[PDB]
Each structure stands twice: as C-alpha cells, then as structure tokens.
From Swiss-Prot, chains A, B:
Effect upon mutating K20R: Confers resistance to indinavir, lopinavir and ritonavir
Lineage, broadest ranks: Viruses, Riboviria, Pararnavirae, Artverviricota, Revtraviricetes
SUBUNIT field: Homodimer, whose active site consists of two apposed aspartic acid residues.
Impact reported for L89M: Confers resistance to atazanavir
Phenotype when changing K45I: Confers resistance to DMD-323
Highest rank taxon of the organism: Viruses
Protein name: Protease
UniProt-reported outcome of changing I84A: Confers resistance to atazanavir, indinavir, lopinavir, nelfinavir, ritonavir and saquinavir
Mutation effect (I47V): Confers resistance to amprenavir, lopinavir, kynostatin, ritonavir and saquinavir
Catalytic residues of the enzyme: D25 (for protease activity)
UniProt-reported outcome of changing L24I: Confers resistance to amprenavir, indinavir, lopinavir, ritonavir and saquinavir
Role of this protein: Aspartyl protease that mediates proteolytic cleavages of Gag and Gag-Pol polyproteins during or shortly after the release of the virion from the plasma membrane. Cleavages take place as an ordered, step-wise cascade to yield mature proteins. This process is called maturation. Displays maximal activity during the budding process just prior to particle release from the cell. Also cleaves Nef and Vif, probably concomitantly with viral structural proteins on maturation of virus particles. Hydrolyzes host EIF4GI and PABP1 in order to shut off the capped cellular mRNA translation.
Impact upon substituting I15V: Confers resistance to tipranavir
Species of the source: Human immunodeficiency virus type 1 group M subtype B (isolate HXB2)
Phenotype when changing F53Y: Confers resistance to indinavir, ritonavir and saquinavir
Amino acid sequence: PQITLWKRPLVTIKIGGQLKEALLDTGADDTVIEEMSLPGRWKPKMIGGIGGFIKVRQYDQIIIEICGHKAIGTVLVGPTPVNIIGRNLLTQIGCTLNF
Amino acid sequence: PQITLWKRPLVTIKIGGQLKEALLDTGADDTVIEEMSLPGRWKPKMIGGIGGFIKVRQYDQIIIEICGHKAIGTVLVGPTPVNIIGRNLLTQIGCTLNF
C-alpha cells in the first residue's frame, strides 16, 4: 500500500504470535524491538541514535510479520523508545520511498 | 524518484545557502540539522530517540531544498550525529512509503 507521512508510519507487526505496533523507519539501518522474549542465542551489538548509544541483543533469522508481509531476519532487542522496522526488513517487504 | 532501501537514503539538501547531505528519515517527527547558524528567533527544545534526548534550537519557517523540491518548515539545529529530514518536510516534497 501507500503510506503518507502526515502522521507516524506505525503498523501492526506480529512477532512470536503477539501483535505489536512498530514504526516503519527509513532512518534506521536495523530493526529494534522493546524488551521481550525471543528464542535462540544472541550476540552483543551497540547501536547509535539521536541521543547516544545503547546496547542491544541481536537475534538472527527471526520470523516477523509486518503489515501482512512475512519477513525473516535480524531483530535487535533493547531499550528503544518505540518498536522500529529498519531497512534490513523494509527491503524484505519491498518498501521504497517515492516522490 | 523511487529510492530503494538497500543502503541509507541520503540526499543532497540546501539550507541557509549551504549544501549538505541528509538522511530521509520516516522515523523522525522533526528535521534535525547538525550545528550551524540560521537567521531568526529560536527557542530551546528537547528531542529524544535511541539513546536518550538532546537539546536543540528550534527555528521556524526555514526554507530547505531537498532533491530540487523546495519546502518550508521548522528546522531543529543541534548535536545530531547525522543530518535528518523528518516527516514535517518529507510530506511537503510529496514523499511516501510504498510496498
């Protein structure tokens, strides 16, 4: 679909059978989700944002449904203000910016 | 144009008669430019995201050219790691998310 930006581009995502709200963020390299439980091992990762850096846990090959589209990729879990869908998964659902 | 998200959506912009690079950021409510001088009155503001908040100077009705598309809006100047074009200006150039 087409999403204008007059308001925050928030969509419903499904990760682990539980629905959540996430922001489609083109300004984000990676997908960062708020603290929750994900299966498998994780690796350390540091990510930078507007306010500074935060430590996050990196989970690979995680199944996540974004707006009806199924993506399977890297998901970072940590202290983020809001759930964000970064470019790593936006490319999986075939999302582009247009003007 | 259509911008894919395989890598950072960076574009050339013109603000205050200076050419700069900025990120097309749908995850940003505002447009935040790295420390520079802009004319007019300004008021302090606190903006947050990953890693916390930063204090910025809010300038209103500032003209910016983004990819040959002229727009006008509020521009925040402060210690941002990268120049970001937020939804307040993204909408003005007719930018949308498509998939």
